[PDB]
Design a binder for this molecule. Structure first.
Ligand SMILES: Nc1nc(=O)c2ncn([C@@H]3O[C@@H]4COP(=O)(O)O[C@H]5[C@@H](O)[C@H](n6cnc7c(N)ncnc76)O[C@@H]5COP(=O)(O)O[C@@H]3[C@@H]4O)c2[nH]1
Lengths: 294, 294
């Protein structure tokens, strides 16, 4: 199997390194008269933060009813601990205000790549987590409990392997015809369908397929579909989206899906996530996962 | 029809208000000796930004190969115009460094609601835009060109109305049985299906339905499905997601879908977005949209 390097979540040791550098710099400040001097700089920052809120009253007043329907807007305007800044302003000029305005005009407070990356993958509001929730709720929550009955119905036409391997290709190749993927992968038949009236559509139909892979074992197998969506979210270039970020979002999607099916409760063992990169081959990986459980 | 208040995109007039306040404050500074003093504050900011990059070398060194595979990491570490800060540091102490570290330790640089809102909806990497791209590529790109042929095939069993009204309920109510939605909405039949081998599944089936609404007109009609996903992304509470943000994300989804089908090229006039809030009724709105085109 190929080496799976998916990124871990952020541990948050940067604050620890900042604290250590703070303590070391205080020790070198060792080897009372200057503490007031600290305040002469400190509220100098906390003015400008307030200034940012003042400018954020600018556009938000054009969004009163359409986004916020007064006190809600000013509640949303500045960071929530606003009284510390005024508390520090009271404990004491135009140069500071003009410097903060000269910063805020030219826009030199642009965050870097790693900061927006941690802000993206920290919140659960990016593309990959929402799309993984869509794939979990819309498909996997519904089909997977009805898998064993259709398997038994085809059985009247190996109980360890009655699962649903989801191929998750961390990359670009997504194929509709898996018989073009290898000469070893062969189509045999399909499962009995599933009929559900979902979201106004009456009798929506979910299907499957059964693939026999030999040298001599059957399995159910399909691709994780919405990666295909990402495959058109950068090729068509109508979304601001790059290939390196495409690989990043695919790894994030596999990580989020692994997390969701980790704490899943209905999906007992019926799923089996197979993920890979491009280093024939795919049948060899399928056979390795298939023999691994036995 | 109900009043549709969807939020406009950010115009960006806050920078203009900052510039005006800058010019006015410079005029009051009117009515050369102090400009060097500006630099004594100015690089005082640009040190600390560099300090943030120093702390962002901390956790990123635990993410060398798993996210970035040296120079790529330091390239991603600080904001890209790094030389202006060192240029300003050269033009001239421990108090400034300790103040910036004391800020970065306690974490008082937390962005407000409106800043993270503009950062979210500014980039095309939130939940609603990616999910709208999924609904456009997976379903609307495929089905809609094959609509007229199925309509003509049922016609051999009103050409102005041969469309697909997508009900987009900006809210919480999403129903599977539209006959429970009103006594006026009646199910009649379904369109001939669509069979496509998509993403490894052989013979995936797309269906539709035809609803006759009288007092005396037929139409095709369905719900925008993945809003249902959002309806379970906060009720089950396994995602950090609120109801006010649910209404916000639904409005954002309708806006993004309106934008995508605005610049669409295959979907000629075959879609017709109907969106509403909860103020019987739904049939009255459907009849108003249906009579509006004629
Ligand atoms: N009304 C309606 N009838 C349909 O047959 C249908 N099929 C798809 N869709 C909607 O279009 C989009 C395309 O599916 P996508 O591939 O991007 O992810 C889909 C897809 O990965 C998976 N899935 C759903 N139905 C099938 C299916 N029959 N076969 C394989 N996978 C499916 O579940 C994901 C989410 O489905 P929904 O989020 O409930 O609505 C889908 C989706 O929004 C349909 N909408």
């Amino acid at each position: 199997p190929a080496r799976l390097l998916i990124p871990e979540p952020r541990a948050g040791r940067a604050r620890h390194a900042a604290c250590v550098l703070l303590a070391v710099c205080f020790v070198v400040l060792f080897l009372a008269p200057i503490i007031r001097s600290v305040c002469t700089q400190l509220a100098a920052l906390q003015l400008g933060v307030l200034l940012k809120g003042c400018c954020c009253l600018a556009e938000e007043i054009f969004h009163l009813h359409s986004r916020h329907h007064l006190w809600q807007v000013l509640c949303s305007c500045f960071p929530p601990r606003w009284y510390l800044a005024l508390l520090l302003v009271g404990g004491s000029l135009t140069l500071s205000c003009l410097c903060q305005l000269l910063v805020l005009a030219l826009g030199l407070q642009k965050l870097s790549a790693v900061e927006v990356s941690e802000l993206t993958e920290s919140s659960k509001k990016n593309v990959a987590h929402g799309l993984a929730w869509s794939y979990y709720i819309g498909y996997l929550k519904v089909v997977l409990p009805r898998l064993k009955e259709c398997m038994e119905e085809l059985s009247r036409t190996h109980r360890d392997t009655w699962k649903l391997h989801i191929l998750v290709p961390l990359g670009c190749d997504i194929w509709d015809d898996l018989e073009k993927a290898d000469s070893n992968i062969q189509y045999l038949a399909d499962l009995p369908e599933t009929i559900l009236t979902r979201a106004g559509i009456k009798r929506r139909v979910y299907k499957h397929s059964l693939y026999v892979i030999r040298d001599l074992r059957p399995c159910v197998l399909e691709f994780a579909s919405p990666l295909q969506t990402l495959c058109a979210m950068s090729q068509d270039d109508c979304a601001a989206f790059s290939r390196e970020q495409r690989l990043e979002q695919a790894r994030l999607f596999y990580r989020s899906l692994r997390d969701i099916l980790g704490s899943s409760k209905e999906c007992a063992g019926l799923y089996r996530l197979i993920a890979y990169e491009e280093p024939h081959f795919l049948s060899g990986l399928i056979l390795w996962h298939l023999q691994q459980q036995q």
